[PDB]
Design a protein around this ligand. Structure first.
Ligand SMILES: C[C@H](CS)C(=O)N1CCC[C@@H]1C(=O)O
Ligand SMILES: [Zn+2]
Ligand SMILES: [Zn+2]
Length: 218
């Protein structure tokens, strides 16, 4: 699968299973993905969107559809596609989780700050939905984290992980190209049985996206 769009087509949600959807927004056209987790205690997002306008629209779409409030967002690094809606989150009383380093970089770059509560490994539970966050090391950015749903073996790779359609490393201004492969290997070592991998940009895939990223780093 079910795919549902906003009137414009700039925001789309695609169902992976009964309680997990991918959200995708176009920023001006460049698509960006996160997750929507439908839990018994509210909606939890992995990542916001490019700006406040899109973040507001995303929240409004999912609250209406799932008939509950967005309570929490996990911010996976301090680039605009991930954190651009932080002002909206904070003013609505939506908890914005991040590592301390992500918060430090957000502040440095003039964004409002997320909580800085996530450690190298953090285990969260929202209703019955289990979420693990993992900092595997530097790669796409110094601060990038991945998000794991152990009840589904779904990995949110974020922008650390390239989609099949990506034929080069893309934006390496903030990247650590000599450490990115080790960081991917750390993800592969931690999660040895993966059902789906959601990249930050592009189509959902599987463990092959991690291997693709390794190949692009050669
Ligand atoms: C503006 C975003 C922030 S991750 C960006 O750097 N992009 C989006 C598509 C390609 C490029 C990248 O992730 O390498
Ligand atoms: Zn980025
Ligand atoms: Zn990105």
């Amino acid at each position: 699968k079910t795919v549902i769009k906003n009137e414009t087509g700039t925001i789309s949600i695609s169902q992976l299973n009964k309680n997990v959807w991918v959200h995708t927004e176009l920023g001006s056209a460049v698509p960006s993905n996160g997750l929507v987790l439908n839990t018994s205690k509210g909606l939890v997002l992995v990542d916001s969107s490019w700006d406040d306008k899109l973040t507001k629209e995303l929240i409004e779409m999912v609250e209406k559809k799932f008939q509950k409030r967005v309570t929490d967002v996990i911010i996976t690094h301090a680039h605009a596609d991930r954190i651009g809606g932080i002002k909206t989150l904070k003013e609505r009383g939506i908890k914005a989780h991040s590592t301390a380093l992500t918060a430090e970089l957000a502040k440095k770059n003039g964004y409002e700050e997320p909580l800085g509560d996530l450690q190298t490994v953090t285990n969260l539970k929202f209703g019955n939905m289990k979420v693990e966050t993992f900092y595997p090391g530097k790669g796409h950015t110094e601060d990038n984290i991945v998000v794991w749903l152990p009840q589904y073996n779904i990995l949110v790779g974020g922008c650390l992980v390239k989609s099949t359609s990506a034929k080069d490393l893309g934006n390496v201004a903030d990247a650590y190209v000599n450490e990115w492969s080790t960081s991917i290997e750390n993800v592969l070592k931690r999660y040895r049985n993966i059902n789906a991998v959601v990249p930050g940009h592009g189509e959902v895939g599987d463990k092959g996206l991690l291997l693709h990223t390794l190949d692009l780093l050669k």
